[PDB]
């Protein structure tokens, strides 16, 4: 009874709207993934938080070389 506007139809994202045993098979499945990516990315925050100083560091060295050029021009 779906090929008619009078016959009722369903929405998008209604499986988790019921609250059955597929809505809790999916609410828990998402926590068993996005809890273990939360410590792949909590461990690599030691490195890249030092790398953003290393990039800044890189820039600093570059700018000091330019200064050096100007200082030699003056000389």
């Amino acid at each position: 009874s779906s090929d008619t506007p009078e016959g009722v139809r369903s929405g998008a994202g209604a499986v988790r709207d019921a609250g059955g045993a597929f809505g809790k098979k999916e609410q828990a499945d998402e926590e068993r993934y996005f809890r273990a990516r939360a410590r792949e990315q909590l461990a690599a925050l030691k490195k890249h938080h030092e790398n953003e100083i290393s990039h800044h560091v890189k820039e600093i060295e570059r700018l000091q070389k330019e200064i050096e050029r100007h200082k030699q021009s003056i000389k």
Binding site: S1, E6, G7
Partner: protein, 117 residues
Amino acid sequence: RDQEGQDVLLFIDNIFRFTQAGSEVSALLGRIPSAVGYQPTLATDMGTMQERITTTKKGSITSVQAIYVPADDLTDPAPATTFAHLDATTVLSRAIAELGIYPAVDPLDSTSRIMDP
């Protein structure tokens, strides 16, 4: 049929608006309604109209009536009562017209009660 003796046809468009208008008359008088909201005299009112279409000894009346099924509910009180009188069905569907076939008749969902050897 009576005064000439021929094989009459008769088209009613449609058999739901006959039924729906009986429920409006019956509720303007004051009668308490039946199941889902129709009138109490729903099967007799259809009876006294549908029984005058028979095959007497002089001639006959045949009938051909279009039916509207509300809310896709084939057990609704108005198409339930109308199906008790039918001797056939004809279904026109949207898909058989796409094939190019005329008239658009669905030969698997159209029935006849006298289909019997």
